[PDB]
Each structure stands twice: as C-alpha cells, then as structure tokens.
Amino acid sequence: GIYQTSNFRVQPTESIVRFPNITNLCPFGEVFNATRFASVYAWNRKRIS
Amino acid sequence: LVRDLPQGFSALEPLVDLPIGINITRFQTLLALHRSYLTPGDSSSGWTA
Ligand SMILES: *[C@@H]1O[C@H](CO)[C@@H](O)[C@H](O)[C@H]1NC(C)=O
C-alpha cells in the first residue's frame, strides 16, 4: 500500500533585500546635524516617522 | 454639482503626524479683512468681507 512519510520541503538558499535609496534626505541632519542637542531641562518630543 | 455636499466619492489623505504637548478644551476660528480705500472726506474705517 501507500504509507505517508515526512513531508518534502525546499528551504530557500538565498536572502537578499533591495532597500530605498534617497527618500527623506538625511533624517538627522536637517535639524540636528550629526550630534547637537538642546539643554537638559528642554525634554522636547521630537520624533521622525 | 447640484448638491452642495451630501453626495461625494473620495477619501481624505493624511500628510504628517505631529505632537502637541498641552491640554486643549476650546477652539476658535479666524478671518481675514480686506482694507477698503475710502476718500479722505469720509473720515471712517471700513472693511470688505
Ligand atoms: C555637523 O557635524 C560635523 C561633524 O560631526 C561638522 O562638520 C559640524 O560640526 C557640523 N556641520 C556644519 C556644516 O557645521
């Protein structure tokens, strides 16, 4: 007769990703440059989405 | 079209999400007044809406 055995599945041999290139033009450099922030007491909420 | 607003077929498009860190309970609208150039003999200030 027929007996079922462990299923046959092929794993993917590659993993390569293509990301965006320019879009939003340097998220941290337009308003904060590289590393430059305000004083301690000014805990301003500045999030970039 | 004939109807001023009840009939329509579209969607509202988001642009940017922003925070506002203060309690809000009341709202008020503004308006613009066009300066009216009157004759010197009128001696009065008027606006056109
Ligand atoms: C931004 O930071 C870089 C180095 O981190 C430096 O050129 C300078 O502090 C800032 N750039 C300008 C143009 O001031």
Ligand 1: which residue has its CA nearest to atom 13?
Answer: A33
Amino acid making up residue A42: A
> Are residues B26 and B37 in contact, defined by beta-carbon separation less than 8 angstroms?
no
Q: What technique solved it? A: cryo-EM
What residues pair up with B48 in beta bridges, in sequence order?
Answer: B34
Task: Fill in the DSSP letter of residue A18.
Answer: -
Rounded to whole angstroms, how far apart are CA atoms B4 and A5?
Answer: 69
Distance of CA A17 to the CA centre of its chain: 11
**Cβ A17 under 6 angstroms from ligand 1:** no
How many CA atoms lie within 13 Å of B42's alpha carbon, on the beta-carbon side?
Answer: 7
Question: Do A45 and B17 make contact, defined as CB atoms within 8 angstroms?
Answer: no
Contacts of A49 in chain B (CB under 8 A): 17
Does residue A33 line the site of ligand 1, with CB under 6 A? yes
Q: What is the DSSP string of B1-49?
A: --SSSS-----PPP-------S-----------EEP---TTT----EE-
> CA–CA separation, A44 vs A37, rounded Å?
10
By three-state DSSP, how is residue A41 classified? coil
| Any atom of ligand 1 within 6 Å of the Cβ of A28 | no
Spatial distance between the Cα atoms of B21 and B23, rounded to a whole number of angstroms? 7
